[PDB]
Design an enzyme around this catalytic site. Structure first.
Site, PDB file in Angstrom:
ATOM      1  N   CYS A 106      28.498 106.974  27.231  1.00 36.23           N
ATOM      2  CA  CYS A 106      29.409 106.396  26.239  1.00 36.23           C
ATOM      3  C   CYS A 106      29.417 107.176  24.930  1.00 36.23           C
ATOM      4  O   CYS A 106      28.380 107.341  24.284  1.00 36.23           O
ATOM      5  CB  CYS A 106      29.025 104.937  25.953  1.00 36.23           C
ATOM      6  N   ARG A 109      28.907 104.862  21.071  1.00 32.08           N
ATOM      7  CA  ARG A 109      27.705 104.126  20.715  1.00 32.08           C
ATOM      8  C   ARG A 109      27.356 103.956  19.241  1.00 32.08           C
ATOM      9  O   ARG A 109      26.460 103.191  18.918  1.00 32.08           O
ATOM     10  CB  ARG A 109      26.514 104.715  21.458  1.00 32.08           C
ATOM     11  N   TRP A 278      37.379  99.750  22.642  1.00 30.84           N
ATOM     12  CA  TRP A 278      38.738 100.205  22.402  1.00 30.84           C
ATOM     13  C   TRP A 278      38.859 101.615  22.940  1.00 30.84           C
ATOM     14  O   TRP A 278      37.859 102.305  23.148  1.00 30.84           O
ATOM     15  CB  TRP A 278      39.116 100.133  20.919  1.00 30.84           C
ATOM     16  N   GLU A 283      41.568 109.192  27.100  1.00 37.21           N
ATOM     17  CA  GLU A 283      41.364 108.413  28.317  1.00 37.21           C
ATOM     18  C   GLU A 283      42.705 108.092  28.980  1.00 37.21           C
ATOM     19  O   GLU A 283      42.848 108.170  30.206  1.00 37.21           O
ATOM     20  CB  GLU A 283      40.631 107.092  28.016  1.00 37.21           C
TER      21      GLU A 283
HETATM   22  C1  HEM Z   1      33.713 100.683  20.609  1.00 33.77           C
HETATM   23  C2  HEM Z   1      34.561 101.395  21.391  1.00 33.77           C
HETATM   24  C3  HEM Z   1      34.142 102.155  22.500  1.00 33.77           C
HETATM   25  C4  HEM Z   1      34.528 103.429  22.691  1.00 33.77           C
HETATM   26  C5  HEM Z   1      35.381 104.267  21.730  1.00 33.77           C
HETATM   27  C6  HEM Z   1      33.890 103.868  23.928  1.00 33.77           C
HETATM   28  C7  HEM Z   1      34.205 105.039  24.574  1.00 33.77           C
HETATM   29  C8  HEM Z   1      33.777 105.391  25.848  1.00 33.77           C
HETATM   30  C9  HEM Z   1      34.366 106.460  26.615  1.00 33.77           C
HETATM   31  C10 HEM Z   1      35.426 107.456  26.121  1.00 33.77           C
HETATM   32  C11 HEM Z   1      33.787 106.398  27.843  1.00 33.77           C
HETATM   33  C12 HEM Z   1      34.146 107.201  29.081  1.00 33.77           C
HETATM   34  C13 HEM Z   1      35.157 106.402  29.919  1.00 33.77           C
HETATM   35  C14 HEM Z   1      35.534 107.099  31.215  1.00 33.77           C
HETATM   36  O1  HEM Z   1      35.747 108.326  31.181  1.00 33.77           O
HETATM   37  O2  HEM Z   1      35.624 106.420  32.261  1.00 33.77           O
HETATM   38  C15 HEM Z   1      32.853 105.291  27.820  1.00 33.77           C
HETATM   39  C16 HEM Z   1      32.005 104.959  28.865  1.00 33.77           C
HETATM   40  C17 HEM Z   1      31.064 103.945  28.834  1.00 33.77           C
HETATM   41  N1  HEM Z   1      30.864 103.081  27.760  1.00 33.77           N
HETATM   42 FE1  HEM Z   1      31.782 103.079  26.010  1.00 33.77          FE
HETATM   43  N2  HEM Z   1      33.046 102.894  24.464  1.00 33.77           N
HETATM   44  C18 HEM Z   1      33.242 101.809  23.616  1.00 33.77           C
HETATM   45  C19 HEM Z   1      32.674 100.554  23.869  1.00 33.77           C
HETATM   46  C20 HEM Z   1      31.769 100.250  24.899  1.00 33.77           C
HETATM   47  C21 HEM Z   1      31.044  98.998  24.954  1.00 33.77           C
HETATM   48  C22 HEM Z   1      31.376  97.780  24.081  1.00 33.77           C
HETATM   49  C23 HEM Z   1      30.094  99.135  25.943  1.00 33.77           C
HETATM   50  C24 HEM Z   1      29.252  98.170  26.498  1.00 33.77           C
HETATM   51  C25 HEM Z   1      28.757  97.081  25.853  1.00 33.77           C
HETATM   52  C26 HEM Z   1      30.259 100.475  26.463  1.00 33.77           C
HETATM   53  C27 HEM Z   1      29.579 100.983  27.583  1.00 33.77           C
HETATM   54  C28 HEM Z   1      29.884 102.192  28.215  1.00 33.77           C
HETATM   55  C29 HEM Z   1      29.425 102.555  29.543  1.00 33.77           C
HETATM   56  C30 HEM Z   1      28.353 101.810  30.365  1.00 33.77           C
HETATM   57  C31 HEM Z   1      30.150 103.648  29.911  1.00 33.77           C
HETATM   58  C32 HEM Z   1      30.114 104.405  31.245  1.00 33.77           C
HETATM   59  C33 HEM Z   1      30.973 103.644  32.241  1.00 33.77           C
HETATM   60  C34 HEM Z   1      31.123 104.367  33.564  1.00 33.77           C
HETATM   61  O3  HEM Z   1      30.142 104.999  34.008  1.00 33.77           O
HETATM   62  O4  HEM Z   1      32.221 104.290  34.164  1.00 33.77           O
HETATM   63  N3  HEM Z   1      31.273 101.163  25.805  1.00 33.77           N
HETATM   64  N4  HEM Z   1      32.851 104.669  26.592  1.00 33.77           N
HETATM   65  N1  LIG Z   2      36.772 103.115  26.234  1.00 37.89           N
HETATM   66  C1  LIG Z   2      36.200 102.512  27.276  1.00 37.89           C
HETATM   67  N2  LIG Z   2      36.256 103.165  28.434  1.00 37.89           N
HETATM   68  C2  LIG Z   2      35.746 102.816  29.775  1.00 37.89           C
HETATM   69  C3  LIG Z   2      36.860 102.161  30.618  1.00 37.89           C
HETATM   70  C4  LIG Z   2      38.199 102.944  30.582  1.00 37.89           C
HETATM   71  C5  LIG Z   2      38.181 104.286  31.358  1.00 37.89           C
HETATM   72  N3  LIG Z   2      39.280 105.094  30.809  1.00 37.89           N
HETATM   73  C6  LIG Z   2      38.321 104.111  32.892  1.00 37.89           C
HETATM   74  O1  LIG Z   2      39.438 103.968  33.408  1.00 37.89           O
HETATM   75  N4  LIG Z   2      37.180 104.112  33.599  1.00 37.89           N
HETATM   76  C7  LIG Z   2      37.069 104.015  35.111  1.00 37.89           C
HETATM   77  C8  LIG Z   2      37.730 105.200  35.886  1.00 37.89           C
HETATM   78  N5  LIG Z   2      36.606 106.151  36.063  1.00 37.89           N
HETATM   79  C9  LIG Z   2      35.300 105.499  35.900  1.00 37.89           C
HETATM   80  C10 LIG Z   2      34.373 105.698  37.109  1.00 37.89           C
HETATM   81  N6  LIG Z   2      33.074 105.475  37.020  1.00 37.89           N
HETATM   82  O2  LIG Z   2      34.797 106.069  38.203  1.00 37.89           O
HETATM   83  C11 LIG Z   2      35.622 104.026  35.616  1.00 37.89           C
HETATM   84  N7  LIG Z   2      35.602 101.319  27.173  1.00 37.89           N
HETATM   85  N8  LIG Z   2      35.467 100.471  26.128  1.00 37.89           N
HETATM   86  O3  LIG Z   2      34.857  99.361  26.341  1.00 37.89           O
HETATM   87  O4  LIG Z   2      35.892 100.701  25.019  1.00 37.89           O
END
Ligand code: HEM
Ligand SMILES: N=C(NCCC[C@H](N)C(=O)N[C@H]1CN[C@H](C(N)=O)C1)N[N+](=O)[O-]
Ligand code: HEM
Ligand SMILES: N=C(NCCC[C@H](N)C(=O)N[C@H]1CN[C@H](C(N)=O)C1)N[N+](=O)[O-]
Ligand SMILES: C[C@H](O)[C@H](O)[C@H]1CNc2nc(N)[nH]c(=O)c2N1
Ligand SMILES: C[C@H](O)[C@H](O)[C@H]1CNc2nc(N)[nH]c(=O)c2N1
Ligand SMILES: [Zn+2]
Lengths: 407, 410
Positions: A106, A109, A278, A283
């Site tokens: 993520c 963070r 958000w 993405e």
């Molecule tokens: C505040 C705004 C947030 C932004 C800008 C953000 C942004 C991102 C981005 C760009 C990714 C990659 C998504 C992808 O390529 O599939 C991601 C993955 C992730 N984020 Fe964040 N995130 C946010 C909030 C959260 C929150 C609230 C949590 C959990 C409480 C979180 C947990 C994670 C996890 C576990 C992943 C990896 C998910 C996966 O393996 O598919 N994120 N985040």
């Molecule tokens: N910005 C995100 N991003 C995570 C979810 C959106 C992301 N663009 C998505 O479609 N994630 C999928 C597709 N690929 C990931 C996978 N593990 O295969 C999950 N989350 N957030 O809480 O703010």
């Protein structure tokens, strides 16, 4: 050992010791690196609970106190008697926030401490889950001024009474396999879009049809629910210069909300813990719109821009990609919906990294996922060495429910 | 053990068995991944086994494993080692070794071309002037008036560690960099330290924005000597844009021959500390990294201004827009001057085909995802979606410390 991480753009070197507390396996070995791989008992429980509580009391400056000892023994007796235990609300909140804090993939963070945690552990039915989810979506959406949140349903018991949200994200578009052989809508959801049909849903057979929720409570069979259209915020995509852009008929939802991961806290497993923050511009514009296995709209936009598509060396794909992303960020900012560009997001992560190193001794990060899918090297994270390792509490992937469920 | 690798764009799954022949460490452990870390005198004892491994690989490659020739060579080498503490590779073995070091280079996206390497044997070289001549011939051969040909020149191997052959330059051709007393830099920032060494050694610097540095060559462990590469041998390309007439006025240009010269080639336990090699550029190397890195020429702003983009907020993606046009400029300029160059879309597509081929015929293809994926437009190239396995195979190219940090001045 004490590892050091350097930034080749600023020469700044950081020392990492937090990794020394890692416990789970990464998937790599001394002979092979699998860094680019997408998916590499009461006796087991107490040590896990002990590990968690120790860090919890350490965070509240009460390590080795009477209160710490008391709690540690209460849980111990509870496990030996109930084969499990229940987290205090305070511990649950601390755990959810740290699971986010430890999410190596993520980039957002720097926001970890602001998480709104919704305790849904008293839930028992699918209608109950639907109610909790609607409230989460409405809370996080906040009329466009998105707020981070997570809703935690009942923890795992005997593996047969698991709560599960079948959707991969609370809000996604449907996908249908057409006669032409082509795909209508989002190809990534074709399979799920069919399990909905195979379950009762009446698919409008559209390009952007918000899918229904398939909720599972206590292990029973999943039920469908339409998310109050009035709660699903959507943004029409138009370019700030190419009036023809709106003719593509493109739109996307404002709330990214992963709902298929597993939250692990002190040994306890919460199989249904949808969370939302958000979007980062790329993405949607790069991955959702331009991936060849997704809406794959590069050629269309390429044509309407009238650029030479005969030779790849004209970088028409690159030119088109940039315009699509400029449109996404413009449409969201115009509709007053929270969204961040990769330049801003990556700048925040670097700041977060430095804070984490001087305050916690480190920060697990997966370079492969942290570097944006476009303009990689012009963002600061590209030049930042990162160390990836697993820490608990944490969010983990888990098998789809339709491949383990017994109807 | 078998290892599966999947492409999430095509769903094509591949199986790797080649990693079973990996011996060197990676830096990663079962508890931590160091995949994004830039930088993660042998005894007779650990020499013959290394020699044996290599020779078995070589004779197996020519379908002569177990042959009398194969057995005699092993005895010959064994005797040589015990008798002299080292051994000499045959010409054929050197060529095979050099091509495979390239084939095994996990960070190189241009490997589809590995079997086409022209190897120049410079093991008879004894002086710095000797090295200069070999290098000049290499530059002229590889340049081939714009129709670039891959090549590597191999100088004498390491003996006792005190007579090393070294090319102090990091690349045969690079632009000088100069730090101004006001704190600004003239030329390429990345070459300031080396440029200072050159000046101290007597180089008369023209102090310009694009001055080709002289070669600093060390032969037989002696003090390095300065040599200017004949200008007529250095092919350069003025950068202009197909639609923006003002681009040319930015006064940008770059050399056409990329020639890494600071790596160590390890073959069958032997170490070749001076082994300059060259191929041709992938567009992004120049346009994205050399021109746009904040720590290099850093021309993004100037280019964004001339395009009159909205530079008030990053959300307008003015950096991304300017980046694309500069890269269009680089590709267009090289193609117009008929100098070999490949765009990242073509280079990554070729690598995917190479990789699949290698898995089938070789059982694997070590690759470093962090380095393979281009520095711009990452996900629209097939490599972004390809899972890759990184491990070390020998023969191989390795980094070695800078010579000015270890050289004992005479
Ligand atoms: C505040 C705004 C947030 C932004 C800008 C953000 C942004 C991102 C981005 C760009 C990714 C990659 C998504 C992808 O390529 O599939 C991601 C993955 C992730 N984020 Fe964040 N995130 C946010 C909030 C959260 C929150 C609230 C949590 C959990 C409480 C979180 C947990 C994670 C996890 C576990 C992943 C990896 C998910 C996966 O393996 O598919 N994120 N985040
Ligand atoms: N910005 C995100 N991003 C995570 C979810 C959106 C992301 N663009 C998505 O479609 N994630 C999928 C597709 N690929 C990931 C996978 N593990 O295969 C999950 N989350 N957030 O809480 O703010
Ligand atoms: C045919 C033309 C070639 C192309 C298009 C090509 C392209 C590339 C690219 C884009 C990189 C990354 C450069 C960077 O970001 O610093 C690279 C690295 C590398 N290539 Fe190739 N290459 C070619 C020929 C060669 C040859 C002839 C050899 C050796 C015989 C070679 C050995 C390597 C090695 C060892 C690396 C990593 C160097 C480092 O770590 O800095 N390449 N190549
Ligand atoms: N296309 C190349 N590319 C490699 C050489 C050019 C590369 N863009 C470069 O400047 N490499 C330097 C800067 N960074 C590397 C490092 N290890 O720090 C070496 N080589 N070839 O043989 O055809
Ligand atoms: C194969 C490779 O691991 C895969 O394509 C990864 C690369 N980096 C990524 N990075 C992010 N943020 N999201 C992704 O889905 C991926 N996919
Ligand atoms: C820290 C990180 O490893 C570093 O910036 C790497 C990333 N990927 C790269 N990829 C290539 N081709 N060349 C580089 O110099 C780098 N630098
Ligand atoms: Zn690794």
């Amino acid at each position: 050992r004490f590892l050091k991480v350097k930034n080749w753009e600023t020469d700044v070197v950081l020392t990492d010791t937090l990794h020394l507390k890692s416990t789970l396996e990464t998937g790599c070995t001394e002979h092979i690196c699998m860094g680019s791989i997408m998916l590499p008992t009461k006796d087991q429980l107490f040590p896990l609970a002990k590990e968690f509580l120790d860090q919890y009391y350490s965070s509240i400056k009460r390590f080795g106190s009477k209160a710490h000892m008391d709690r540690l023994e209460e849980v111990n007796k509870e496990i030996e008697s109930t084969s499990t235990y229940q987290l205090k609300d305070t511990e649950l909140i601390y755990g959810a926030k740290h699971a986010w804090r430890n999410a190596s993939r993520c980039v957002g963070r720097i926001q970890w401490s602001k998480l709104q945690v919704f305790d849904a552990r008293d839930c028992t039915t699918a209608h109950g889950m639907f109610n909790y989810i609607c409230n989460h979506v409405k809370y996080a959406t906040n009329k466009g001024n998105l707020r981070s949140a997570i809703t935690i349903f009942p923890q795992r018991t005997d593996g047969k009474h698991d709560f599960r949200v079948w959707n991969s994200q609370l809000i996604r578009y449907a996908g249908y396999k057409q006669p032409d052989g082509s795909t209508l809508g989002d190809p990534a959801n074709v399979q799920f879009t069919e399990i909905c049909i195979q379950q009762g849903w009446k698919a409008p057979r559209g390009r952007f049809d918000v899918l229904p929720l398939l909720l599972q409570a206590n292990g029973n069979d999943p039920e469908l629910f339409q998310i109050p259209p009035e709660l699903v915020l959507e943004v029409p995509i138009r370019h700030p210069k190419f009036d023809w852009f709106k003719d593509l008929g493109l739109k996307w939802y404002g709330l990214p909300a992963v709902s298929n991961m597993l939250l692990e806290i002190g040994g306890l497993e919460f199989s249904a813990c949808p969370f939302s923050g958000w979007y980062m511009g790329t993405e949607i514009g790069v991955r959702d719109y331009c991936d060849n296995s997704r809406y794959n709209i590069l050629e269309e936009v390429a044509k309407k821009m009238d650029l030479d598509m005969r030779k790849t060396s004209s970088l028409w794909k690159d030119q088109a990609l940039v315009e699509i992303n400029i449109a996404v960020l413009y449409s969201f900012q115009s509709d007053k919906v929270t969204i961040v560009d990769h330049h801003s997001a990556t700048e925040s992560f670097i700041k977060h990294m430095e804070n984490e190193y001087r305050c916690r001794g480190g920060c697990p990060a997966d370079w492969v996922w942290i570097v944006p899918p476009m303009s990689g090297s012009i963002t600061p994270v590209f030049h930042q060495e990162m160390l990836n390792y697993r820490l608990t509490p944490s969010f983990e992937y888990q098998p789809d429910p339709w491949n383990t469920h017994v109807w």
